[PDB]
Each structure stands twice: as structure tokens, then as C-alpha cells.
Amino acid sequence: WPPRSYTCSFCKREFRSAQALGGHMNVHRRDRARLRL
Ligand SMILES: [Cd+2]
């Protein structure tokens, strides 16, 4: 978890937001889409 960027844990993806991550983590629910992993 860097200063100018944060992780969702579930997508282990670094983002440049705060509230967008909180919301983006709550949007998590299965894959149900493409993407190899
Ligand atoms: Cd996420």
C-alpha cells in the first residue's frame, strides 16, 4: 500500500484514489466476465 496509490487486495491492483477503491472493493463479486486471471 504505497502513499500516492493503494491496493484493493481482491484485484491486488494499484490505484490513485481512496473513495474509488472503497467503492471498487464493494463492487467485487465473482469474475462473470473475460480476463485470463
Ligand atoms: Cd479492486
From Swiss-Prot:
It is found in: Nucleus. Expressed early in the third whorl, and later becomes localized at the boundary between the stamen and carpel whorls. Also detected in developing ovule primordia. Disulfide bonds: none annotated. Induction: Repressed by KRYPTONITE/SUVH4, member of the histone H3-K9 methyltransferase family that contributes with other factors to the CpNpG methylation of the SUP gene resulting in its silencing. The alternative epigenetic states of the SUPERMAN locus have been called Clark Kent alleles. Positively regulated at an early stage of development by LEAFY and by B class homeotic proteins APETALA3 and PISTILLATA. Later expression is maintained by both the B class homeotic proteins and the C class homeotic protein AGAMOUS. These two steps of regulation require the intervention of additional factors. A zinc finger (C2H2-type) spans 6-28. Mutations in SUP cause the ectopic expression of APETALA3 leading to the development of extra stamens at the expense of the central carpels of the flower. Contains two overlapping leucine-zipper-like motifs at the C-terminal region, which might serve as a site for protein-protein interaction. In this domain, a slightly degenerated ERF-associated amphiphilic repression (EAR) motif seems to be involved in the activity of transcriptional repression. Probable transcriptional regulator considered as cadastral protein that acts indirectly to prevent the B class homeotic proteins APETALA3 and perhaps PISTILLATA from acting in the gynoecial whorl. Principal function is to balance cell proliferation in the third and fourth whorls of developing flowers thereby maintaining the boundary between stamens and carpels. May fulfill this role by repressing genes implicated in cell division. Plays equally a role in the determinacy of the floral meristem. Is also required for normal ovule development. This is Transcriptional regulator SUPERMAN. It comes from Arabidopsis thaliana (Mouse-ear cress). The gene is SUP. The chain holds residues 42 to 78 of 204 of the full protein.
